Amino acid sequence: KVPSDIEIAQAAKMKPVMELARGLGIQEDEVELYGKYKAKISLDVYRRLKDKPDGKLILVTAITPTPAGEGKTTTSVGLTDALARLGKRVMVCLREPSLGPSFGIKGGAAGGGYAQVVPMEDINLHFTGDIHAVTYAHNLLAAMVDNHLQQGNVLNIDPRTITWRRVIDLNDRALRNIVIGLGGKANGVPRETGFDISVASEVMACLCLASDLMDLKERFSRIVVGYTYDGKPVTAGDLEAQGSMALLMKDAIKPNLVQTLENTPAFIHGGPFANIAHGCNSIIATKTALKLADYVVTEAGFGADLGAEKFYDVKCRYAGFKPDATVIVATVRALKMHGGVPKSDLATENLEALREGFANLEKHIENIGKFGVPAVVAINAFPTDTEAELNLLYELCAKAGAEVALSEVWAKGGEGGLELARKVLQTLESRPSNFHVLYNLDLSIKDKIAKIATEIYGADGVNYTAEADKAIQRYESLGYGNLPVVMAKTQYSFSDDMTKLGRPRNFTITVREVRLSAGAGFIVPITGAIMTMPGLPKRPAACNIDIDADGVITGLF
Amino acid sequence: KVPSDIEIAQAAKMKPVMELARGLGIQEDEVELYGKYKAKISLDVYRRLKDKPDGKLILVTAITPTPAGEGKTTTSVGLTDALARLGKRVMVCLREPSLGPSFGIKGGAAGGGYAQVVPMEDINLHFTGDIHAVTYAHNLLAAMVDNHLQQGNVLNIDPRTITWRRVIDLNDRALRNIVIGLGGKANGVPRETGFDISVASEVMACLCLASDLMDLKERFSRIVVGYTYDGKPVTAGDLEAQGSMALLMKDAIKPNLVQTLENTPAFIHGGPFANIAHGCNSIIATKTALKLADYVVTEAGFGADLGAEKFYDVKCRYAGFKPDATVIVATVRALKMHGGVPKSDLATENLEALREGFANLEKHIENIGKFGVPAVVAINAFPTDTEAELNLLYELCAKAGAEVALSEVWAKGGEGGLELARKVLQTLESRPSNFHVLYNLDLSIKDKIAKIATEIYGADGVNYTAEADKAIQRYESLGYGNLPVVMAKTQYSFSDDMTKLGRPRNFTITVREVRLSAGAGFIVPITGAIMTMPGLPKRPAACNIDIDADGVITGLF
Amino acid sequence: KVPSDIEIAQAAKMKPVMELARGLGIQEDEVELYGKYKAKISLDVYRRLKDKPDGKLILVTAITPTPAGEGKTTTSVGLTDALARLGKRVMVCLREPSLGPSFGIKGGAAGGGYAQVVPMEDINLHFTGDIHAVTYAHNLLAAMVDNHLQQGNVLNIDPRTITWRRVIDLNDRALRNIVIGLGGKANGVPRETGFDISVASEVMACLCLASDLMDLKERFSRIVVGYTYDGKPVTAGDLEAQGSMALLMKDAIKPNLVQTLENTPAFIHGGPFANIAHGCNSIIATKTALKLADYVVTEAGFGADLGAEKFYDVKCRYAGFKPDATVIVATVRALKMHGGVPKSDLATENLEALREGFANLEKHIENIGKFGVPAVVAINAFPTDTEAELNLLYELCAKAGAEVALSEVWAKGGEGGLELARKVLQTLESRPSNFHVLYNLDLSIKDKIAKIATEIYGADGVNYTAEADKAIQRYESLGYGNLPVVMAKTQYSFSDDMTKLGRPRNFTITVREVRLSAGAGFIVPITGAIMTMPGLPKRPAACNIDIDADGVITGLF
Numbered sequence A, B, C: 001k002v003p004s005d006i007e008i009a010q011a012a013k014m015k016p017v018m019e020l021a022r023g024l025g026i027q028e029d030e031v032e033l034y035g036k037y038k039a040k041i042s043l044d045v046y047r048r049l050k051d052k053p054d055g056k057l058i059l060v061t062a063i064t065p066t067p068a069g070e071g072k073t074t075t076s077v078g079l080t081d082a083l084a085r086l087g088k089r090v091m092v093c094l095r096e097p098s099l100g101p102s103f104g105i106k107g108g109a110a111g112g113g114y115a116q117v118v119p120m121e122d123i124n125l126h127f128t129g130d131i132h133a134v135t136y137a138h139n140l141l142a143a144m145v146d147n148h149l150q151q152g153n154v155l156n157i158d159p160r161t162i163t164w165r166r167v168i169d170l171n172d173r174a175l176r177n178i179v180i181g182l183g184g185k186a187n188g189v190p191r192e193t194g195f196d197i198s199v200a201s202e203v204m205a206c207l208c209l210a211s212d213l214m215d216l217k218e219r220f221s222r223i224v225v226g227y228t229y230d231g232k233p234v235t236a237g238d239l240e241a242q243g244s245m246a247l248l249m250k251d252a253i254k255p256n257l258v259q260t261l262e263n264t265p266a267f268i269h270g271g272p273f274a275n276i277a278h279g280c281n282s283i284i285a286t287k288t289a290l291k292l293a294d295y296v297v298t299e300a301g302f303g304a305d306l307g308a309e310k311f312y313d314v315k316c317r318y319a320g321f322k323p324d325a326t327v328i329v330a331t332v333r334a335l336k337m338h339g340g341v342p343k344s345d346l347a348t349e350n351l352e353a354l355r356e357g358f359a360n361l362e363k364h365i366e367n368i369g370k371f372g373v374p375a376v377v378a379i380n381a382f383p384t385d386t387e388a389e390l391n392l393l394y395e396l397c398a399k400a401g402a403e404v405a406l407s408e409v410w411a412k413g414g415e416g417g418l419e420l421a422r423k424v425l426q427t428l429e430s431r432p433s434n435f436h437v438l439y440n441l442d443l444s445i446k447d448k449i450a451k452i453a454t455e456i457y458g459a460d461g462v463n464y465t466a467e468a469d470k471a472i473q474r475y476e477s478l479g480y481g482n483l484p485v486v487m488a489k490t491q492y493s494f495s496d497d498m499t500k501l502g503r504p505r506n507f508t509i510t511v512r513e514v515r516l517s518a519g520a521g522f523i524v525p526i527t528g529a530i531m532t533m534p535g536l537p538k539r540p541a542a543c544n545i546d547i548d549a550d551g552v553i554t555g556l557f
């Protein structure tokens, strides 16, 4: 009865975004078309509107996901469309989907059913070339580092201490660990290295936290690539790369204006994952939106223990933002998995499993409450959620003493979210927010890690491999102790162990390796077995993907 | 009717070699036993006998071989035993068999049937530890080069120009091309390198050309391992390795006294291949023998185009030796292959194929004639050679105007070689020898290569990959232009192409790569597709090899 | 001014070992000579003497070492000469020194000063070629594995699960992690691997545990080299290598007779280190010696936490030995270090530091107690040791209630060990032992690791990496949980952290990898950061090593 997401999105009727742009106080000459239905907005907009009030910032987070994902994006789009249908001047900010997973298992990040962002197949693929620009600035610097070595290694880099990897925006497990520079003296210096997925690039991180291009250029210059034989850092600015890198990012800095199925305006800009990067769209896109709309709905990657924590502690911190509300996306199907139902068994009514699994939602609620921001739960109704299940979960959130609304936006568009949209509005004028960060920058890297570990995931404490201890020692002694922490861990549990479902108790977080993002300005401790480059499944989506003589596309989702 | 070679050799009745040693003017205290049946002889022997006359030097060479090999060793042992049975004070000098091929396809190098050197399984395996000492001196230096790099690379070596490889005395194709030094800064410097088979080591080459240990130590020091960033050679003596290397060779320098099935004394010492190294036993062993015997029978590796040429042009040249006679080993089965008979078809009478194939023998004859040394052909009779075939070949050598004798030594021991033994003796007192080298040291590396290429193999000229041209340029400009040439090429043809049987005409030798043995004092141009490390077959001999509770050994050959 | 080890040892006055052997009732035809002064003794000696009575077994162990070593070997030899000088029929059993450390930092393992085993230079270099025999059996198995991958990978081995490594008897850090099999389809199958030092070989383990050559062979056949794609184990037996592996071991299996400076007989057989391997000489040498002497002195590598532990729990367990007494070697310098004094200062008087550092020795004393064997402390006097220092320690070991004797065997030979020899004799007359193992084979792998960590090292618990977890579970599931355990762990601490000196408290062991030795018959958990292939220092002893034209050796120590 509901057709495939690509059928829906190829049948969308879109407004010219030059219109939407003008319907928002954006001058004809601050728009740069990419066809009729996509544009980039000048940063002169936010500059000229510098001293004007902000609208209401709404974050959308979720519970602990299955591989299918639980509907933040779908919801965020839905919520925005619903608010438009109560006549509000609203905008949704989102992340650009990584190209890789569209050919893997997760698919794109445009939403679902009647809550989608269109032109969906442009959004999921090349979109407007932002990720490509990140990839080329990133890999440019890498080429220059390798050329430095070849051209007599003037700065005396120890090639075996180079942390700068390369990137490609595909799921390519064969490029995790590689030796390059082979073939003899004409062909470079042999060394061990590898690729991360482009969206996890520090270059993207910079895009996402910078305020303008000149700042991006300054940040690029601070990026640390390796170390000399006697341990002194070597930066991109030592290698004089920041100018070219910036040049390659000349258009990528400007955010992108698309729209929803119901013609509501949308910014898409930046796309770092939350398990392996900071999980928010650009600061640039959200500060702009907030000068142009009254309500700005925005998403953080994966669960509340990842994206929400990072949204609050890194992005909101660097931006000045004060979230007004937070929506917590929950599903019956996932809360059931969390209570012991097998993945292949999730479409079957199971009410006990929804009482048991609830622990998960409960901790996410408690954790958001910790930031001082009023929450609403949103029940994302799935095709096969039953009558009782949907009734029980509702009652558990009110019994839990927390705002809640059913959301039928997947199946019904914005009018699936009016209930939800009111409750959020109710929240805005009734419970003001009192946001504050989880931790002060002061603290040791190790104390900061322990605050997240215990306050958010609920472990007893934090294990450190000796490689981690050295790295941290090195980062504190060089004067980067102040930076905040972007944790890498599995999205599938509060723990660093992906098998531990629900609210797991009495465990340890094992920090394997610690990275320094001197340009983005944060520290990345890698926990558990998480990789910074994902792989493809037995049957990649790519095998079912196609296009025809008419431009009809199948298998994209 | 003839039992397996290992049955024969385990049933040998051996004299105590301390006896044989004394039966030769060797003092009780110049012998170092390794059991009753193997010893090492002091170099004080040759030193004290410095100014005493030499005996007659007899070389044993052959035609172009099949994979089975054509019987030089078997013959050399046979010839020696036959001469003993005409009451002569004779000794045979041979090469130590490489361990690797005993587990591969060729097997050992102790001889065959009733012409063998015993204790055969000691000779084929660890023998007296000479090859192990080469391997450890060689790999010691390699370890020190790698440690130099790790310890701050004081001499400024460009690790990508290191020519020093590692060695192991096995047929291990997986170690041809390897990257080592991986795992990060605590674990070395990544680089591309590999292993050659121990018997092809420059360290062995040195053993084989040195006169005493102090000379070996001096030669070790001249070995060139790599080059600095600005192209200056780096030597083992720069790295101060020659003392330890020499130390590891303290016993390996002394030659080994074993004996034949018929109790005739034997020296075994050094074992470089002839296709990929210089193909002679040590100078040390042959100069000693020649002070202790009246007739000294000695072997050069593979065909006359390889071993004989190198025996004359490198060893005899550096030693002073003047070969008195040369025996050319020929077989019907091989001359048949050379005339177009498939390998799986060689046990079947084929007289036309023996007239056609003869071209091969004819060129080897002409080539030896070129050195000014009187030749006898030896027909090594194989179990299935027919009556007519053996008759025809005889007549072709006399018709060819060249001395010839049937040799039944494989099946009958020394009394299979009396005919042969007389003809050689006939030769000694009737046709004096007038040996002289093929070329003067003066010449360019390139002229020297062309002399061998055209005079010996019969190609039109010599191709050079650009890598070869650079290397040669580098070796001439550093002042190693004078050194002689040890060619690497296939044993299976006069050409550098192994498929070209018989006397192939109008072809080119392609020199792929050129190596410098500054310690051994020669240049090694690698031609065709020949590797310096061989591989194992589909079913390695090793699968049929065993020993039992009694020490009965099967499958060694 | 005791002359350097090498001057003493070259100046030695030895007896032919043939005499030495007759005086133990070994027959002429059971001795196989390697010079006048080395032999290999037939396994027939032990066999024929099977039902005769065993002598007293005495273990020599030590406290936690400095890098230079605290004198176990120096003491084992001394003790043995000292016993002989008390008119006792006594034999020392030692391990063949690994070759690489002669060129490294540690040096050889022939003893020191006037307590050495001889001929030193041989004993430390190629000796009788046992290690080479190990090296070639191990590396032929590795060559056959790679060849199998090349010839169709018929057994379906997953090349990336291959645990079998290569070996070489050098300190080569560049061979730790390597990529082999490169160069294309003719040159093998690319894979990650590396080299361990030859003495840490499973082949070495088997030699050290086996009873005869047919036993060795059977052990070989059961060695697991890696796994199929679906997880089945693959053995040397499946590849039919055990036959050829045994051939190469035909002589390695027989133990070696040498002697001390004072001409006491000596067995030297098997070389395994105690940090990365099982750290005792062969059962063969020990059990044989127990038939020929009334007293058999024998050493375990590094400290009691490694060597003694393993001697007791795997050697004695498998051999049916019940050790009779145990010497703990201790020095002022090592104890001073343990009480905080920096290495560069261990020459200088500091009674206080020695008092605090006593903690180390105390724990080792306690630990030996848990085995049921009476102990004597041997205080091995160094030239730097002051009067009051040797007195304090003596008084401390007495107050601690331990039998103690000052030892001057380094400087005085066997007559400097009479007091020590006296105390040992005293212990054997009055105080029988009630030897018991530390754990049963019934226990699980983690049970047995936790006992050794807990009761011996004084660890609070053990941590496992995911990979360690998996390998343990793999081994239990496959039928090997029953095996005893040979921990790999730093020698420099009771902990797995090499800087935690004295008697570290409240620490945990971390197991990062678990090897299976299915043919030796034990399990090897690797802990902390310890590598199974060591490195060469800033300045190798190699650089200082030399031999002259007279055969006068310098630098070897």
Ligand SMILES: Nc1ncnc2c1ncn2[C@@H]1O[C@H](COP(=O)(O)OP(=O)(O)O)[C@@H](O)[C@H]1O
Pocket: A005, A062, A068, A069, A070, A071, A072, A073, A074, A075, A107, A108, A109, A110, A111, A112, A113, A302, A380, A381, A382, A383, A410, A411, A557
């Ligand atoms: N209520 C729903 N019913 C069915 N499918 C849904 C629903 N909500 C989302 N989906 C689909 O499941 C996937 C997960 O939704 P998405 O918004 O991408 O979640 P998230 O952003 O949390 O990963 C997408 O394919 C989406 O189209």
Ligand SMILES: Nc1ncnc2c1ncn2[C@@H]1O[C@H](COP(=O)(O)OP(=O)(O)O)[C@@H](O)[C@H]1O
Pocket: B005, B062, B068, B069, B070, B071, B072, B073, B074, B075, B107, B108, B109, B110, B111, B112, B113, B302, B380, B381, B382, B383, B410, B411, B557
């Ligand atoms: N006349 C013969 N009949 C049968 N087999 C022989 C004969 N001569 C040699 N062989 C065997 O064939 C192989 C080649 O002989 P060998 O002396 O090793 O030749 P080369 O030294 O030229 O390689 C050896 O296995 C040898 O025992």
Ligand SMILES: Nc1ncnc2c1ncn2[C@@H]1O[C@H](COP(=O)(O)OP(=O)(O)O)[C@@H](O)[C@H]1O
Pocket: C005, C062, C068, C069, C070, C071, C072, C073, C074, C075, C107, C109, C111, C112, C113, C302, C380, C381, C382, C383, C410, C411, C557
């Ligand atoms: N009492 C001593 N005085 C001086 N040097 C010694 C003494 N005892 C041993 N040494 C030397 O110190 C090193 C370590 O002795 P060693 O017996 O090898 O101890 P271990 O066997 O425990 O390593 C050797 O070089 C040895 O000759």
Ligand SMILES: [Mg+2]
Pocket: A071, A072, A073, A074, A109, A299
């Ligand atoms: Mg999403």
Ligand SMILES: [Mg+2]
Pocket: B071, B072, B073, B074, B109, B299
């Ligand atoms: Mg031969």
Ligand SMILES: [Mg+2]
Pocket: C072, C073, C074, C109, C299, C301
């Ligand atoms: Mg020792």
